[PDB]
Amino acid sequence: DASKLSSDYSLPDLINTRKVPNNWQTGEQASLEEGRIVLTSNQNSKGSLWLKQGFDLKDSFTMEWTFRSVGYSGQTDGGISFWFVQDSNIPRDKQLYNGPVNYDGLQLLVDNNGPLGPTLRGQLNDGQKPVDKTKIYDQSFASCLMGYQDSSVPSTIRVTYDLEDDNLLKVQVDNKVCFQTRKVRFPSGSYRIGVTAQNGAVNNNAESFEIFKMQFFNGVIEDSKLITKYI
Numbered sequence: 001d002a003s004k005l006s007s008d009y010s011l012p013d014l015i016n017t018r019k020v021p022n023n024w025q026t027g028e029q030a031s032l033e034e035g036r037i038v039l040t041s042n043q044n045s046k047g048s049l050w051l052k053q054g055f056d057l058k059d060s061f062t063m064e065w066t067f068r069s070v071g072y073s074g075q076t077d078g079g080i081s082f083w084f085v086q087d088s089n090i091p092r093d094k095q096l097y098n099g100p101v102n103y104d105g106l107q108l109l110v111d112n113n114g115p116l117g118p119t120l121r122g123q124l125n126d127g128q129k130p131v132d133k134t135k136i137y138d139q140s141f142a143s144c145l146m147g148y149q150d151s152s153v154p155s156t157i158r159v160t161y162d163l164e165d166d167n168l169l170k171v172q173v174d175n176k177v178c179f180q181t182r183k184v185r186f187p188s189g190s191y192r193i194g195v196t197a198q199n200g201a202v203n204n205n206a207e208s209f210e211i212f213k214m215q216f217f218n219g220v221i222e223d224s225k226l227i228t229k230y231i
Contacts, residue, residue, distance in 0.1 A: 001217065001221050001222065004062075004217040004218050004219045004221065005215060005216070005217055006216045006217060006218055008023060008053070008216075009023075009051060009055055009063075009193060009216035010214055010215050010216045011024055011049075011211070011213060011214035011215075012213070013035075013212070013213055014032065014034075014035050014036055014037065014212065014213075015034070015035045016034075017032065018032075019032065020032050020037070022052075023051060023052055023053065024049060024050065024051055024052065025049075025050060025052055025090075026047065026048065026049055027047065027048035027049075027050070027098075028046045028047050028048055028094075028098060029041065029045050029046060029047045030047030030048055030049055031047075035212065036210040036211060036212045037049055037210065037211040038208060038209075038210050039080065039195070039196070039197040039208075039209040039210065039211065040078070040197050040198060040199045040207060040208055040209050041206065041208045042206050043199070043201075043204050043205070043206055044198075044199065044200065044201045044204075045198065045199050045206075046094075046098040046196075046197070046198040046199075047098065047196070047197055047198075047209075048094075048098055048099065048194060048195070048196040048197075049194055049195050049196075049211060050090045050192060050193070050194030050195075051192065051193045051194060052090075054087070054088070054089075054190035054191060054192060055190065055191045055192075055193055055216075056188075056189075056190055056191075057186060057187075057188055057189060057190075057191050058188055059163065059218065059219065060160070060161055060162045060163045060164060060218075060219050060220045061160075061161055061216065061217060061218060061219070061220075062158065062159070062160045062161075062215075062216070062217040062219070062220055062221045062223070063084070063158070063159045063193065063214065063215070063216050063217075064156055064157070064158045064159075064213075064214065064215045064216075064217075065082055065156065065157045065159075065195065065211070065213075065214050066154045066155070066156045066211070066212040066213040066214070067080065067110075067154060067155060067157070067195070067209065067210060067211050067212065068148070068151055068152070068153070068154040068155060068209075068210050068212070069110075069148050069149050069150070069151065069207055069208065069209050069210070070150065070151070070152070070207075070208050070210065071150075071206055071207055071208045072149065072150065072199070072205045072206060072207035072208075073149045073150040074149075074202075074203060074205065075112050075113060075117075075202070076112065076113060076199065076200050076202040076203065076205050076207060077113050077198075077200030077201065077202045078111065078113075078197070078198050078199035078200040078202070078205065078207050078209075079097050079109055079110060079111030079112075079113070079197065079198065079200075080097070080109075080110045080111070080195060080196070080197040080209045081096070081097040081098075081099050081107050081108065081109050081110075081195065081196050081197065082107070082108040082110075082157065082159070082194075082195050083099055083100070083103065083105070083106070083107055083108075083192065083193065083194050083195070083196070084105050084106045084159070084186075084191055084192075084193055085100065085103040085104055085105035085106065085107075085191060085192050086104040086105050086127070086186070086187070086189045086190065086191050086192075086227070086228065087100075087103075087104070087190070087191070087192045088190065089192075090192055090194070091103060091192055093130075094196075095130070095133075096131065096133065097109065097111075097196050097197065097198055098196040098197065098198050099194075099196035101130040101131055101133070102125070102127055102129070102130045102131075103125050103127060103131075104125060104126050104127030104227050104228050105124075105125070105186060105191065105228050106122065106123070106124060106159075106169075106184070106186075106228070107122075107123040107124075107125070108120060108121070108122060108123075108157065108159065108171065109121045109123060109136070109140075110146065110148055112148075112149065113202075114136070114137035115137060116137070116143070116145060117145065118145065118146055118147050118148055118149065119140075119143050119144065119145055119146055120143060120144050120146040120157065120171065120173060120178050121136075121137070121140040121142070121143040122140060122141050122142040122143065122169075122171065122179060122181075123136060123139065123140055123141070124141055124184060124228060124230050125228070126227040126228045126229065127227055127228075128227070141181065141183070141184070141230065142171075142178075142179035142180075142181055143178075143179065144171075144173070144177075144178035144179055146173055146178065149207070154210075154212050155173060155174055156173070156174055156175075157171065157172070157173055157178075158170075158171070158172040158175070159171055160172075160220050160221070160223050161186065162220045162223065164220070165182075165220075166182050167182050167184070167185060168180060168181075168182055169181050169182070169184045170223070183230055183231050184228070184229075184230060185228065185229040185230075185231055186228055187226030187227065187228065187229075188226070189226060193216070195211060195214075197209040
């Protein structure tokens, strides 16, 4: 697995790091603080963290994001979104959790404003139309229940896309399967990888979403014009 780790698309541990790693960039109110990038803080905050360069999808990959939420417990309109989307530059649109409403690819949404409570949901789009935000919870292609708030220990989301297992897309939270599917077909192309968050305005909350680490691997780890399709 070391041999497969990609330094170009990973975010190293941020302890004693005095600047954002140069292959990434923050946006909006996101900032580097000691040991973590803080996406949101204080009220009605938004932040983004994206890789500067696209990823050429030609083979299986794994991506592991380590994050946490601190500072608020309760239902809100906030959320954190992890993206894997086909685009030539960082996505321009910021309407959907401070990320693109018109994406072509995958949105993984962690939030608690839907009827099921705190969830990790998979959303898909193919760039032809913006998604209808009013239908997001009814349109998830897959989901699991996932407690994330007010939680000191960070969580790790592992996303694997395994072409050698008939295009298995598998999403794990701390190594437990959240969902998996073979229905999602990402075309070869250049993809943008990043995370965006907002805490919203509900109850003037100051929920703070934090990113600690992200590891990107070429291949599948120990789990041995074209647009996204859902078959």
